[PDB]
Amino acid sequence: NLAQNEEVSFTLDGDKFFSKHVAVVGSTGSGKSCAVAKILQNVVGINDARNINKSDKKNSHIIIFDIHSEYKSAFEIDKNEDFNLNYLDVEKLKLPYWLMNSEELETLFIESNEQNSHNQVSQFKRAVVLNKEKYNPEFKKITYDSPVYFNINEVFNYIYNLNEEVINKIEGEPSLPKLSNGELVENRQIYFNEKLEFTSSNTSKATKASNGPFNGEFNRFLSRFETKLTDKRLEFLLLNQDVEENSKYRTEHFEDILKQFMGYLDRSNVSIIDLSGIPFEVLSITISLISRLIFDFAFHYSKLQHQKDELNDIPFMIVCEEAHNYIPRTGGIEFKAAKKSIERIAKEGRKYGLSLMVVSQRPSEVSDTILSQCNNFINLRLTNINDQNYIKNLLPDNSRSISEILPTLG
Amino acid sequence: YGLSLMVVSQRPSEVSDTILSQCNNFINLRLTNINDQNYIKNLLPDNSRSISEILPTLGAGECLVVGDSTPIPSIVKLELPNPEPRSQSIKFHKKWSESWRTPSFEEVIMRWRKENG
Amino acid sequence: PKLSNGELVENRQIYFNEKLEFTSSNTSKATKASNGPFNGEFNRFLSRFETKLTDKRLEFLLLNQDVEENSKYRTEHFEDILKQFMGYLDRSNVSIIDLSGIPFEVLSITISLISRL
Amino acid sequence: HNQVSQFKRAVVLNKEKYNPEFKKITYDSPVYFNINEVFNYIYNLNEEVINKIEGEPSL
């Protein structure tokens, strides 16, 4: 209802508001979470803890990215009312890390902070192609986004051999690595099965040998890697398992992950993805994959509907909660993968049925490449001149009469 | 050599200054942002002083014409084109106000994986 | 350069045919060899080539398709391309160029190409 | 950066030359390394002379 006249109702067009990008910015202790909850509750159809559509199920789809919880309680309606909620705790969600793996795990698997990447990826690529080609005849690279499975333990037995191997250098023999007994390694395909013992390097022609290309150069790095293989805080990205009791995903169980994030396993309309349990500076690992899978599905589903003159029938909305924790303005390299998928959705999501809601309370720290794509603004109270200036430099209407009402709003 | 240009934009303050400053004719519509009005007023070869303040109050179908071709700056009411340009987009509210729909996940993974890719 | 079989390199143009395999550098005079001037300065660059040479969305650029389906597009189809973008094939007065399917990172180059042509 | 790299290498090598009870260590964990040994290492590297006699190891 209108503030000045409570006898007049306020209505907004739904095809112009929810079909484009929206931004919700406010101050501390103003009612931001309450407003978002009220809007989403009106969208789904909950009124006074009652489900209006008890006999019929409607076609609404919303995904929420939570980093402080605070939103499950808003959808815990009574069991009598037919309303299922899809709550996923990522810390116990079992996300595979081999589907994309380009900017999530291999970013910290063969490189951590050093320029030694120039020789860190020279033989691991060949071994991983060997494994993923022996499983099935295909082609792979160091970066590869296809949903395929490889055994990390085997392929990094090769990496352990890299600093636990000495190449033979005896005159009159082929340049093939010499084992402890004296066997010459014809092909390095036996390395990833299990690490082998090689004789020490020597200059005498009887047992002449030279240290391998990456011998002794990365002992600390592989120590860190094998530490992370059993880290007590990374069980959710199938890392503490490393091919164990839960490894029965060969090539054709990719549908389960999509049905889990989308919520097509129990007929749910709201999905919550909680990132509170996950430690810091490892949360951008999964965003780049969750944001990519939905976009790929939307694109590929939209393509296979123009042969019969139709359009997409399952639009989606994504609700970010704190955009300054993983999409900052002044940043370096620790936030790279997410800031590309979000850009793709913000620049190519209107023709494929995908929108965005950006919620924050410090607008002066969010990337302008994403916040300038928004068409509708809901402004709460603001008391900082920097935020006021930044907002009034982006609003479609910048009349002064409407800018003096911000720090007078209850 | 036989070439010209026409620049259409809704944020004149974010376009390159070199290209935009070499334009001899202007067609202005409603503007509500102060920065855009200031930039247009700076880059406007005319004698308009008070008629340039009517931009934030212009209606639908009205434009302000200034330049060399016109003898005097003026305000012109335009008609509607026939046929009319229209874009194709999906309406989220209308499609959200229907019954439950199930996609075909089997068909969207055959195209997704066309012998890898 | 010395290969696995020890054959020398009469001309470097043989590098334009296949991925040759070379020998291992050593200090002993039997197989004395050294690293080339550029042996590790291109590691991720080749991978980024392999990424862009198989992307199906960048198909209109003819980066991919070593197959002979359109490998005959030598320097004799340059007139047809110009006549297509100027409307002199099946004469027309308005030429509308749509760019709504192009990835957002390869949009500027197409406009630059058409404008320069 | 050259002296920083030499310091890093010397500290890594001397970090657990006699400290096996830290199974997993790269640089940062709180373990004791003698700084004078690192200084002697760098000084020897500055004064390093390589033997080139034929028939003898290149040491």
Contact in structure between A323 and A360 (CB atoms under 8 Å): yes
Do A117 and C26 count as a contact with CB atoms less than 8 A apart?
Answer: no
Task: Tell me how long chain D is.
Answer: 59
The resolution in angstroms reads 3.3
Do C23 and A175 count as a contact with CB atoms less than 8 A apart?
Answer: yes
Q: Please identify among residues 38-67 of chain C the ones whose CB lies closer than 8 Å to any CB of chain A.
A: 40, 43-44, 47, 50-51
Say whether D56 sits in a helix, a strand or coil: coil
The method of structure determination was cryo-EM
Do C43 and A347 count as a contact with CB atoms less than 8 A apart?
Answer: no
Closest by Cα among A159, A179, A173 to A111: A159
Tokens of residue A261, six digits: 């994030």
Q: Does A393 touch chain B (CB under 8 A)?
A: yes
A221: nearest CA partner in chain D: D26
Contact in structure between A373 and A323 (CB atoms under 8 Å): no
Say whether A376 sits in a helix, a strand or coil: strand
Closest by Cα among B98, B93, B96 to A56: B98
Q: Phi/psi of residue A87, each to 5°? A: -105, 125
* Residue B83: cis peptide before it, omega within 30 degrees of 0: yes
Which helix (H) or strand (E) segment holds residue A25: the answer is strand A22-25
Contact in structure between A66 and A272 (CB atoms under 8 Å): yes
Do A19 and B90 count as a contact with CB atoms less than 8 A apart?
Answer: yes
Say whether A34 sits in a helix, a strand or coil: helix
Say whether A171 sits in a helix, a strand or coil: coil
Within 10 angstroms of residue A138's Cβ, the number of other Cβ atoms is 14
Beta-strand pair B62-67/A22-25: unpaired
d(CA B40, CA A375): 22
Q: Phi/psi of residue C65, each to 5°? A: 65, 65
Beta-carbon pairs below 8 A across chains A and C: 30
Q: Please identify among residues 181-240 of chain A the ones whose CB lies closer than 8 Å to any CB of chain D.
A: 203, 220-221, 223-224, 226-227
Breaks (C-N over 2.5 A) in chain C follow: none
d(CA A352, CA A302): 6
Report angle CA A36, A41, A43 to the nearest 5 degrees: 100
Minimal Cβ distance to A348: which of C23, C24, C104: C104
Closest by Cα among D36, C50, B100, B105 to A60: B100
Do D and B make contact via 3 or more CB pairs under 8 A? The reply is no
Give me the amino acid identity at B91: K
Q: Phi/psi of residue B67, each to 5°? A: 155, -170
Tokens of residue A197, six digits: 């013992």
Cβ burial, residue A395 (10 Å; 0-12/13-18/19+): middle
Q: Which residues of B touch A353 (CB under 8 A)?
A: 90, 92
Alpha carbon of A246 to those of A249, A250, A360, B54, D11: distances in Å? 8, 11, 38, 69, 41
Do D25 and A220 count as a contact with CB atoms less than 8 A apart?
Answer: yes
Minimal Cβ distance to A227: which of D24, D27, D57: D24
Do C104 and A169 count as a contact with CB atoms less than 8 A apart?
Answer: no
Tokens of residue C100, six digits: 């709504």
Minimal Cβ distance to A18: which of B32, B88, B92: B92
Q: Which residues of A touch B39 (CB under 8 A)?
A: none
Give B3's Cβ-side CA count (13 Å radius).
Answer: 5
d(CA B23, CA B37): 17
Residue spans of alpha helices (H) in chain B: 17-20, 34-42, 92-96, 105-110
Q: Phi/psi of residue A358, each to 5°? A: -110, 115
What residues pair up with A25 in beta bridges, in sequence order? A360, A379
Radius of gyration of chain C, Cα coordinates, nearest whole angstrom: 23
Chain D contact partners (≥3 CB pairs within 8 A): A
Report which DSSP code applies to A189: G
Q: Which residues of A touch B99 (CB under 8 A)?
A: 56-59
Q: Which residues contact C48 (CB under 8 A, 6 or more apart)?
A: none
Contact in structure between A120 and A110 (CB atoms under 8 Å): yes
Contact in structure between A44 and A270 (CB atoms under 8 Å): yes
What residues pair up with C3 in beta bridges, in sequence order? C22
d(CA B82, CA B85): 9
Closest by Cα among A371, A289, A293 to A337: A289
**CB burial string C30-46: b at 16+ within 10 A, e below:** eeeeeeeeeeeeeeeee
* Extended beta strands in chain C, E state: none
Q: Which residues contact A37 (CB under 8 A, 6 or more apart)?
A: A71, A74
Do A254 and B109 count as a contact with CB atoms less than 8 A apart?
Answer: yes
Cβ burial, residue A78 (10 Å; 0-12/13-18/19+): exposed
Do C30 and A171 count as a contact with CB atoms less than 8 A apart?
Answer: yes
